Amino acid sequence: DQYHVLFDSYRDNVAGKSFQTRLCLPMPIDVVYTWVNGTDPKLIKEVTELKRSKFEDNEELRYSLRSIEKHAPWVRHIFIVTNGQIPSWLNLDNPRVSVVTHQDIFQNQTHLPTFSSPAIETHIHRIPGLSQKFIYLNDDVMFGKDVWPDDFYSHSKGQKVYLTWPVPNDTFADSLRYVNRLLNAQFGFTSRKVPAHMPHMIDRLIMQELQDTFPQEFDKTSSHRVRHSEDMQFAFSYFYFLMSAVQQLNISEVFDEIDTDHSGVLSDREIRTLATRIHELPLSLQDLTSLEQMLINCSKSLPSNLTHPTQEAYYDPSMPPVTKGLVIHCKPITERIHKAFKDQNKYKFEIMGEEEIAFKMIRTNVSHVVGQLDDIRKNPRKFICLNDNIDHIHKDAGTVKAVLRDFYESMFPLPSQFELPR
Amino acid sequence: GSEVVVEWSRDQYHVLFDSYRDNVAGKSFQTRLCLPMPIDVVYTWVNGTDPKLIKEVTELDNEELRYSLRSIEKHAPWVRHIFIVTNGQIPSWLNLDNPRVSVVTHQDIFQNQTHLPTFSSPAIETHIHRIPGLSQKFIYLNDDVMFGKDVWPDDFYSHSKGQKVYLTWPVPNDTFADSLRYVNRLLNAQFGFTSRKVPAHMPHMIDRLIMQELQDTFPQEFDKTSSHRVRHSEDMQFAFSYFYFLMSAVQQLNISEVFDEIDTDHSGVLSDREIRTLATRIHELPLSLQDLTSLEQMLINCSKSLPSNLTHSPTQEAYYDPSMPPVTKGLVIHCKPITERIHKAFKDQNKYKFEIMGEEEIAFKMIRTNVSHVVGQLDDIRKNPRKFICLNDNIDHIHKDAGTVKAVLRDFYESMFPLPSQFELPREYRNRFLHMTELQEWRIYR
Ligand SMILES: *[C@@H]1O[C@H](CO)[C@@H](O[C@@H]2O[C@H](CO)[C@@H](O[C@@H]3O[C@H](CO)[C@@H](O)[C@H](O[C@H]4O[C@H](CO)[C@@H](O)[C@H](O)[C@@H]4O)[C@@H]3O)[C@H](O)[C@H]2NC(C)=O)[C@H](O)[C@H]1NC(C)=O
Ligand SMILES: *[C@@H]1O[C@H](CO)[C@@H](O[C@@H]2O[C@H](CO)[C@@H](O[C@@H]3O[C@H](CO)[C@@H](O)[C@H](O)[C@@H]3O)[C@H](O)[C@H]2NC(C)=O)[C@H](O)[C@H]1NC(C)=O
Ligand SMILES: *[C@@H]1O[C@H](CO[C@@H]2O[C@@H](C)[C@@H](O)[C@@H](O)[C@@H]2O)[C@@H](O[C@@H]2O[C@H](CO)[C@@H](O)[C@H](O)[C@H]2NC(C)=O)[C@H](O)[C@H]1NC(C)=O
Ligand SMILES: *[C@@H]1O[C@H](CO[C@@H]2O[C@@H](C)[C@@H](O)[C@@H](O)[C@@H]2O)[C@@H](O)[C@H](O)[C@H]1NC(C)=O
Ligand SMILES: *[C@@H]1O[C@H](CO)[C@@H](O)[C@H](O)[C@H]1NC(C)=O
Ligand SMILES: *[C@@H]1O[C@H](CO)[C@@H](O)[C@H](O)[C@H]1NC(C)=O
Ligand SMILES: *[C@@H]1O[C@H](CO)[C@@H](O)[C@H](O)[C@H]1NC(C)=O
Ligand SMILES: *[C@@H]1O[C@H](CO)[C@@H](O)[C@H](O)[C@H]1NC(C)=O
Ligand SMILES: *[C@@H]1O[C@H](CO)[C@@H](O)[C@H](O)[C@H]1NC(C)=O
Ligand SMILES: [Ca+2]
Ligand SMILES: [Ca+2]
């Protein structure tokens, strides 16, 4: 029927092959939250006891889930990672939402019970059934305008990386120095901006490569049951590993691009294209002859089996059939290719501005808070984060909270399918 | 025994249909998640050796198209159909048995037959959007343009940023500069003055509806371009007009949609909290109580002045001002002082989205007769592949190296695309007639 129409359409091209995976954005895409209820009396008690041995929110999770229904309807499933706690309002009868406990994902149960968000965020990529590319949100992060997968990833330019300038006041600044040193030690020194406070798309395969590259440091982050100065940063480590990981060129794939006839043997014309790849222009005759003599030299030295339909005519009658095996095993040639194309990024990425991110630090100046929120009302942003820095000692703290509620209810007044009928 | 069960198995078509509804909304967003398809390619091709052609002009190559079609098979395999627009001429090598390629004659697309026969590409380019069966978004190439790297529909268009526009700095030598001047005047008069760059020499994606809107905007000038059987200084430039119409066409804001965005509960009446958002949209921040009350008074005055049927309960809405009427959609739309400040606060909005692009992926080379410079130009493409390649023929046949330069090009073409395409007849075979009219008559007679 109409299902047959779509399946036939993507093959309706000169190649007769479907390119739907390239023409369409990656799906599925799941969402992962981490959530905690700080009013839980058992939790408060167990935290302080650990502090001796070594708090109500703004219902951000609720409103963030409304922002998904409104602005990210393409999301498949929503995982809420907790210690076992479940929000009272959560409608777990809805199959689209589920709760994953720290036990379900943590590798060393002795690290649990945990009270460290970086430790949890070390294992959120281990959620069973999680989509290869998922989007991780802190509950204070939400969508303020319609978003699409292309706001996080494109096929041509890879993942989008939203970078901001660090703040010296950040408590994670010690953690940034610890991660910066590990990254400088691994890839060389660079000055690094910090990923913006926003929903982060994470690729499970890349994340595991990052954690396999620094296995002890992620285990050390997981083992700290409270935030530590030597913790690995979720967004900072991932996005800079994505941008720093290098890969060497695959010679056999370089060969195939040169071997435009797909014969498996490089003609003189194709050898020339190889010559331009490893030599500066203009090309000299000797650049070409030296490349030729490298192939002739290598054919004699290399064993016959490694060197391996139609005979090829060469200007030099001494020229052997320039087979793939010969080019790959000819180190003088492969080394100059790698020299010409120095170690290159394994992954594609696109640096982005902060234009679509609206980060506000909510203190207790009521008139300042109304001024901050009125800015979001006037100029909508795709990614909004109202960071709760309210001081309960101050008298106007309750007023500021009522202003946030007024703002949240102005933007997302409709209950979502994840709130119980109530 | 006996018992039956519903089928767990889903064909890959049901798998795809189910996957696109597998989201919190239960709705398919495939049109937004996937690039627009189908996408066709359109060429213009002419054979200069044709004696009938040489005759009609006076009375008034490197087989690049072959290699360009090879570049599509290698680098743009997603293309649905390839239309070749001719005066009637049929390439000898073209395999008209392939249903992917077809030959369209100027008669099929031109509106006034008296303009034909034509010898002006700007005239033909005026009607290529009239091809029957053409995809709404298509890619128009001259035969000298080819793909030198893997290309994809997102190299021309995205859902988020609209069509990509590749602009270059104008060249005073270019012959179309007189045409550029003529078009610039019409554009200045229609959209106001802007300084305008020229679209690069490359494949151009055209939307048939946008192109028709452009030609509906300047109907006499495209008829005048069509009427000129040879290129003229008052000819409309194909790419320059389309892309600057796309970027300049403005759309007036839809006030009811602004209302709907502010009406976040969808109740149809703006609450006080929703009104505050509208106040920030039309006032500079910070928002003073004067700014808010001013908007509150504009709504109060309008409910009195306007007809009661235009101002128009699901829920009782409580306002800070007891004088505040229910702020309905009709009240906000008809209230001139509000909509004026709305339209002032939001500048005139481009009807179409677009993305300005650099020229990095475009490799435009003008081939003269200096062999050394040509080999250097071609070696630059061999060393640094580019998505869009244009090798413009400016070779002088008088020069002795002309035959050599022509041999270097075909060597470069063969080095990049040695495999024959599905659109080429075998080398030994050849279409019997070089004109469609000869082929049409011969098949009626059989
Ligand atoms: C975060 O943790 C806090 C602390 O654990 C938690 O607050 C507690 O919530 C429960 C309900 O979720 C409260 O219990 C209520 O108590 C009142 C009287 O004090 C009762 O009237 C309520 O009864 C209703 O609900 C019952 C259960 O369905 C029904 O059987 C009954 O008929 C009524 O309909 C209810 O039992 C408890 O008092 C608070 N305690 C504190 C200290 O706040 C909070 O819910 C957690 N937040 C989230 C988002 O999960
Ligand atoms: C572009 O146009 C030219 C001219 O129309 C095409 O070449 C011409 O092709 C015709 C048909 O094959 C040739 O006619 C043949 O002539 C030979 C020798 O006179 C004769 O033995 C055959 O029986 C037939 O009559 C014609 O000679 C030839 N002319 C020239 C100058 O080459 C050419 O094929 C066209 N190219 C494309 C790509 O369509
Ligand atoms: C269709 O075109 C004819 C011809 O237009 C002329 O010839 C073209 C090749 C080109 O050179 C044009 O600039 C010419 O104007 C139109 O017939 C002309 O009509 C006008 C107005 O009645 C008259 O002054 C001319 O003498 C006519 N010329 C001829 C050759 O008939 C015709 O009106 C056009 N019709 C439509 C619907 O576009
Ligand atoms: C699992 O963890 C065990 C305990 O490690 C200790 O406790 C944790 C909570 C941290 O405080 C850590 O600093 C302590 O060293 C280890 O003894 C055990 O080896 C770990 N398991 C594995 C397989 O490594
Ligand atoms: C290199 O590419 C070829 C195919 O082009 C593939 O078979 C091979 O596994 C690749 N090798 C590496 C190391 O990626
Ligand atoms: C080839 O081998 C000879 C002898 O070992 C050596 O002198 C020459 O420099 C070599 N050339 C290349 C290109 O490897
Ligand atoms: C913060 O409060 C002070 C008075 O307490 C006021 O002057 C100021 O306007 C407020 N902040 C801003 C940014 O307006
Ligand atoms: C504005 O949008 C509404 C809702 O889709 C529609 O009914 C109305 O015709 C639109 N108005 C204009 C001028 O486009
Ligand atoms: C041809 O080009 C080369 C390289 O740019 C230059 O050195 C040479 O002088 C040119 N010769 C002529 C006749 O233009
Ligand atoms: Ca070969
Ligand atoms: Ca409302």
UniProtKB/Swiss-Prot annotation, chain A:
Protein topology in the membrane:
Single-pass type II membrane protein
EF-hand domain boundaries: 246-281
The protein here is known as: N-acetylglucosamine-1-phosphotransferase subunit beta
- Which residues are noted in the entry as Ca(2+)-binding? 259, 261, 263, 270
Q: Where in the cell is it found?
A: Golgi apparatus membrane
Glycosylation is annotated at 250, 297, 305, 365
Q: Which gene encodes it?
A: gnptab
For this protein's source organism, the top of the classification is: Eukaryota, Metazoa, Chordata, Craniata, Vertebrata
Q: Which domain of life is it from?
A: Eukaryota
Q: Which organism is it from?
A: Danio rerio
From Swiss-Prot, chain B:
Recorded topology in the membrane:
Single-pass type II membrane protein
Report what the protein is called. N-acetylglucosamine-1-phosphotransferase subunit beta
Originating species: Danio rerio
Q: Which residues form the signal peptide?
A: none
Q: Where does Ca(2+) bind?
A: 263, 265, 267, 274
EF-hand domain location is: 250-285
Q: Which residues are glycosylated?
A: 254, 301, 309, 370
Its taxonomic path starts at:
Eukaryota, Metazoa, Chordata, Craniata, Vertebrata
Q: Where in the cell is it found?
A: Golgi apparatus membrane
Q: Which domain of life is it from?
A: Eukaryota
